[PDB]
Design a protein around this ligand. Structure first.
Ligand SMILES: C[n+]1cn([C@@H]2O[C@H](CO[P@@](=O)(S)OP(=O)(O)OP(=O)(O)O[P@](=O)(S)OC[C@H]3O[C@@H](n4c[n+](C)c5c(=O)nc(N)[nH]c54)[C@H](O)[C@@H]3O)[C@@H](O)[C@H]2O)c2[nH]c(N)nc(=O)c21
Ligand SMILES: C[n+]1cn([C@@H]2O[C@H](CO[P@@](=O)(S)OP(=O)(O)OP(=O)(O)O[P@](=O)(S)OC[C@H]3O[C@@H](n4c[n+](C)c5c(=O)nc(N)[nH]c54)[C@H](O)[C@@H]3O)[C@@H](O)[C@H]2O)c2[nH]c(N)nc(=O)c21
Ligand SMILES: [Mg+2]
Lengths: 58, 257, 178, 26, 260, 23, 175, 65
């Protein structure tokens, strides 16, 4: 049920990062690269148009 | 719009040659008459046009090699030949030119990467990729789609990645073959020209994977970089069943819909 | 090696050859080295299997009892034009000697002044032609309402094509223009 | 001997149908 | 974390009942002591607790049901029974209260909508969806999630779409069963409480639909809700196929043009 | 005839809304 | 049927029962009808399996040889204290989930730092507790360094507990 | 078929700007849409775009069929 650690991309500006946790309301990333790097990045589903996943931590 | 006759049916050989000369050599833009190598390509397409069509309409016509056809053409219309070199020496210069021309081809895989389509022309007897020479100002992809569509009768316009390829050089000739998958085995394959290729077939990528490691044209020189691709592709498909899962599930927990 | 000699031979052999397809050709009016054809349909352009030298020529239609010959297409297509039948009344012709297959591209050209004589059954289904040039494409609406687009290799001939066809539509036969 | 190509110089110069203008009488 | 003892293993039935009284009935906030029903829920929890835990800690204790349990409790701790109703008549009033409590549940589907997850209770009887009674001031999706987690051990947080549901009123009992897809048939479903759920099994939804269209079977609610269910699986399977064609498309278009 | 169980049965908040200890 | 009778029976019976778990209980100091407990680790709260009435009580440690009992038989589970019984106060949740109750020892800061002044330094290493309220959650840093948060049902009590706990930490213990 | 005419298409430019429209015809070099709606505002009955200016493309609906 957990997908934390998947390589994730979000859009509006595009953010790429590692999934720290997901809830119906909020999404957290680590080592987020900016279309800039940040150790912790907090984003809400309100500011997300779309989401895509490419790579897994296995 | 206007009803045109078919002179090729009843016309003598000299006049049929005249027709071909109008179609292929007499009226080409000057850029195509610059060198012997350039004009000889128009001679070549003209010869093929004679064999594939004109010979079919009038069986009373002779079978003409490219050499013989060139002879009759330069004899019936001497004004379209402005170099004093022998046509049989000009043919060897022609071959000196067609050996430095790049060439693009395709690795044709089914959904199951079991089979890979290769072709066998009449003379060679050793199987090889579907490929051909590049044209003027042509993307390598458009090139590949055109020649693969020619030899195998299949449009690859939606099956080619500009990144999944592998290239090597033989003797100054820059080869380049892309890697495609998902071609339907069911759909038939036919050369667009009847007299170019004998057989177009595929067998299991494994059944003769290591038959070549006894030590098959060109495919052997790039089997290892190809092998990496096919195995990567199978396990990446098994992965493909999973990435979808994760994607849609994460999408449902948010306002993605 | 002579330019003038080769020019003469080119025009002459082109006439001799086109004559065997259209036996009523009388004079070559214009020629361009290469042209590609598209047909308009389904509100979209569709590249046709015609490619080669293009020529516009005058035709002999003084005989008012000659009917266009009857030739079976023999099918060697998805969409093929209506081959004109009936009496030969078409002053001008356009042809593309095809490099792709042995079927050449053909368009008849008739002035409006000729086709509006229908007044006073008809074997003809003729409507005034149209021609326009835009974005280097030469678009033509034929006498049977087919819409084709000719793309000429040499750019300065594109306009030259348009201006010729337009002339041939506004005036009756004269033997007067390039 | 390099940069060499084959066939007619005009073989692929015809533009693709997606780049052509729409006629003003259709 | 100070070390405590385990008196339940070694106390007489009376002192064990006193323990349950301080755990479930004596110290609850005032609203839970307002009506006979509000407290009878606590009696019920205490009886379940006795049966599941303390009876298996001290095998000298007898086997009680909620009726005998209520008897003994009101015997040992009379000061908690505030009303002048026979505990039995109070029980009939308790069932009458339960009769009209909204029930939220979930029709749960495999990602390939071939099978649907159903369960049967201790009296095997029939099969139905995981479901439960609504709590105090709780949203229907919170109730559905909580109850399917207690009945199956599975959390339906991300899987529930609050608009895909079926609603049926049978006897003033308002049933609402949500529609969910994409749960793994892999998961091992265990109930959180024993003596509640007899069995948990997937059923072939096609064969089950043919079976409910019997001449006259083995099912509760699902037979009443079968056509909206089937409709849901039609739109979902069809939508999966359309997503396949769509994917084929976008990949091919990105091949015709240049991704790189 | 509204609800079942304890009045406090479903009042416990989810961990995602709780403050950080910070001491 | 009398409010005064029922409250006395509640206090007396609560003491009688808690005494069967912590025999060293001496006096009930505080009680609240319902409380849920969470443990903190991995920078997010985890809801534990304890739920029910909460009681803060005084303990009897006049005896000095007092040694704690033992269980009849990874860091997610708490550490149960061993060694000398020197804990003045106790907190307990009487669980409605399963038979195991929630226990937290409470030793004031003075008694602890005074316990420091003892040669062996062999008895179990402890740490002064802390207590905080934030957005209605009552967080406690235990002797064993574990940190918990308590959500009490009755709103007025959320403050009360805190002050009381704080009181029990800051002051010397008697009566 | 080789044609995907009628598919509902959404494309993106350099600044994440998105164009939505119905696919009229497609070739390796150019893409044509009808009734294109623009994220930042504006409708257009016919919209012609080159593959050079496209950063990503994704598909929404199938043709009504
Ligand atoms: C359009 N059309 C074609 N034909 C029939 O084909 C003949 C004309 O030849 P192509 O130019 S269409 O192409 P290919 O036949 O493949 O020969 P290549 O020399 O152009 O190029 P590579 O084979 S990709 O090789 C590159 C160079 O290295 C040499 N080489 C070749 N092989 C097999 C090997 C080998 O096994 N091992 C080594 N180490 N080197 C090898 C190769 O020789 C070349 O120099 C025409 O005669 C037709 O038969 C047509 N026929 C008709 N009727 N109509 C058409 O339109 C047509
Ligand atoms: C937690 N716990 C339970 N138990 C023991 O096992 C039994 C189950 O627990 P509930 O008492 S909380 O009962 P539930 O199943 O949750 O609800 P409902 O049975 O009141 O009613 P509906 O099934 S939602 O239906 C509502 C109305 O329609 C009628 N109906 C019901 N069924 C199944 C059918 C059917 O198959 N066919 C038809 N035609 N109608 C049907 C229904 O009768 C009603 O009128 C409890 O009783 C306990 O004995 C536990 N035991 C222990 N030791 N520990 C626990 O924690 C526990
Ligand atoms: Mg239930």
């Amino acid at each position: 049920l957990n997908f934390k650690g998947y390589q994730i991309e979000i859009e509006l500006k595009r953010i790429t990062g590692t999934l720290k946790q997901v809830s119906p309301k909020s999404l957290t990333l680590t080592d987020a690269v900016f279309q800039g790097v940040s150790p912790v990045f907090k984003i809400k589903a309100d500011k997300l148009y779309d989401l895509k996943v490419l790579k897994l931590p296995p | 719009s206007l009803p045109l006759l078919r002179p090729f049916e009843t016309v003598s050989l000299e006049n049929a040659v005249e027709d071909l000369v109008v179609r292929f050599i007499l009226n080409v833009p000057p850029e195509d008459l610059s060198t012997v190598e350039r004009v000889l390509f128009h001679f070549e397409e003209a010869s093929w046009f004679y064999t594939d069509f004109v010979k079919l309409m009038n069986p009373y016509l002779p079978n003409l090699s490219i050499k013989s056809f060139s002879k009759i053409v330069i004899d019936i219309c001497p004004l379209i030949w402005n170099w004093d070199i022998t046509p049989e020496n000009a043919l060897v210069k022609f071959s000196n030119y067609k050996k430095t021309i790049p060439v693009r081809g395709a690795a044709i895989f089914n959904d199951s990467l079991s089979k890979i389509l290769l072709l066998r022309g009449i003379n060679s007897k050793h199987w090889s990729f579907p490929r051909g020479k590049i044209g003027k100002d042509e993307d390598d992809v458009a090139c590949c789609i055109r020649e693969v569509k020619e030899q195998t009768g299949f449009d690859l316009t939606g099956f080619i990645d500009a990144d999944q390829y592998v290239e090597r050089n033989m003797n100054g000739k820059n080869f380049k073959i892309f890697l495609v998958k998902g071609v339907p085995e069911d759909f038939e394959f036919k050369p667009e020209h009847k007299n170019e290729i004998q057989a177009i077939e595929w067998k299991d990528f494994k059944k003769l994977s290591k038959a070549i490691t006894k030590n098959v044209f060109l495919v052997n020189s790039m089997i290892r970089p190809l092998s990496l691709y096919v195995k990567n592709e199978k396990r990446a498909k098994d992965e493909n069943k999973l990435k979808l899962y994760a994607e849609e599930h994460l999408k449902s927990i948010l306002g993605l819909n | 090696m002579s330019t003038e000699t080769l020019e003469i031979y080119r025009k002459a052999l082109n006439f001799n050859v086109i004559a065997r397809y259209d036996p009523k050709i009388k004079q070559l009016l214009f020629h361009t080295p290469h042209a590609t054809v598209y047909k308009w349909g389904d509100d979209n352009w569709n590249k046709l299997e015609y490619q080669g030298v293009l020529a516009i020529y005058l035709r002999d239609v003084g005989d008012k009892e000659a009917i266009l010959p009857e030739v079976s297409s023999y099918d060697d297509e998805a969409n093929t034009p209506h081959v004109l039948t009936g009496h030969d009344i078409y002053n001008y012709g356009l042809i593309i000697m095809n490099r792709i297959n042995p079927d050449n591209f053909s368009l008849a050209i008739a002035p409006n002044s000729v086709l509006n004589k229908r007044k006073l059954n008809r074997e003809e289904e003729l409507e005034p032609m149209k021609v326009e040039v835009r974005d280097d494409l030469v678009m033509i609406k034929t006498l049977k309402k087919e819409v084709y687009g000719i793309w000429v290799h040499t750019p300065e001939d594109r306009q030259n094509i348009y201006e010729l066809i337009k002339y041939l539509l506004e005036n009756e036969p004269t033997d007067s223009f390039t | 001997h390099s940069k060499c190509y084959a066939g007619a110089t005009f073989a692929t110069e015809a533009p693709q149908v997606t780049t052509l203008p729409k006629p003003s009488f259709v």
